[PDB]
């Protein structure tokens, strides 16, 4: 016989506990109404050297947001890096259809993002299909809290984001958008964990058209997650840990995948 440890009961990793506290705060203690909780792969940039952030640690570590580290986060990657992940997720997609597996879901969206002005300036995003031009979403999204994880052994760093995405009334058809861009979205879903592989194309009157390549992992079932968090605040914290552990483990898998 073999036991996990001298207690023979599983224990929560330090990182999982901290992130769980972070989520419990904005789900329960200071609740966000229309909350979205996603993590994006990117690069942690040092504002001085303008290169990737450098830190004398040797493992995935959460940065304390109360300190001023002179840092910014770039949610982007090379098209080659994007294609590598796209092939990996596809293989993972196909494998999950095999017997005895909990299968993936797939959803490929091709949309148009149109940004409008408001009165008290201060953004309205209207998403639409490129095909039939039918409205997909009309929101006012505000960033609430950020939490960065420096990951020295990998090519990417992680930014867990909490946002408030408020559904708003459509702008009048006689006011012009301040910005217009295209967005290709390849969504994989596994156990209600949304893995979106996005590509953002933006025109310019002067400069060459740019393409931003992103990857986002997010909780697809906020209502159920909220329930798990409420239990955690009341002692029963195992279901929340299990859920956050899954989220992070999917993120870590994708973060290590590089040519």
């Amino acid at each position: 016989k073999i036991e996990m440890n001298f207690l023979n009961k599983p224990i929560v990793p330090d990182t999982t506990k901290v992130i769980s506290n972070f989520l419990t705060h904005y789900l329960i203690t200071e609740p966000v109404e229309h909350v979205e909780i996603e993590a994006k792969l990117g690069t942690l940039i040092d504002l001085e050297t303008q290169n990737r952030f450098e830190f004398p640690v040797m493992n995935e570590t959460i940065l304390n947001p109360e300190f001023n580290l002179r840092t910014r986060f770039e949610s982007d990657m090379t098209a080659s890096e994007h294609k590598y992940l796209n092939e990996f997720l596809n293989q993972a997609f196909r494998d999950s259809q095999k017997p005895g597996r909990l299968p993936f879901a797939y959803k490929h969206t091709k949309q148009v993002d149109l940004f409008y002005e408001t009165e008290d300036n201060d953004k309205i995003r209207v998403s639409k299909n490129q095909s039939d031009n039918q409205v997909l979403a009309c929101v006012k999204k505000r960033r609430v809290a950020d939490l960065f994880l420096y990951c020295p052994n990998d090519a990417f760093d992680i930014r867990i984001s909490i946002s408030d995405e408020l559904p708003v009334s459509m702008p009048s058809g006689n006011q012009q958008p301040s910005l217009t861009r295209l967005k290709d979205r390849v969504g994989y879903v596994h156990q209600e964990i949304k893995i979106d592989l996005t590509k953002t194309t933006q025109n310019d009157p002067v400069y060459d058209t740019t393409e931003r390549h992103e990857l986002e992992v997010e909780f697809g079932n906020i209502a159920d997650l909220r329930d798990r968090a409420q239990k955690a605040k009341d002692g029963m914290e195992a279901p929340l840990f299990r859920r956050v552990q899954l989220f992070m483990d999917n993120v870590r898998i994708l973060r290590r995948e590089h040519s």
Binding site: V18, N21, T24, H25, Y26, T29, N64, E66
Partner: peptide, 6 residues
């Protein structure tokens, strides 16, 4: 220092 939620 430590954030409020931790």
């Amino acid at each position: 220092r430590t954030p409020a939620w931790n």
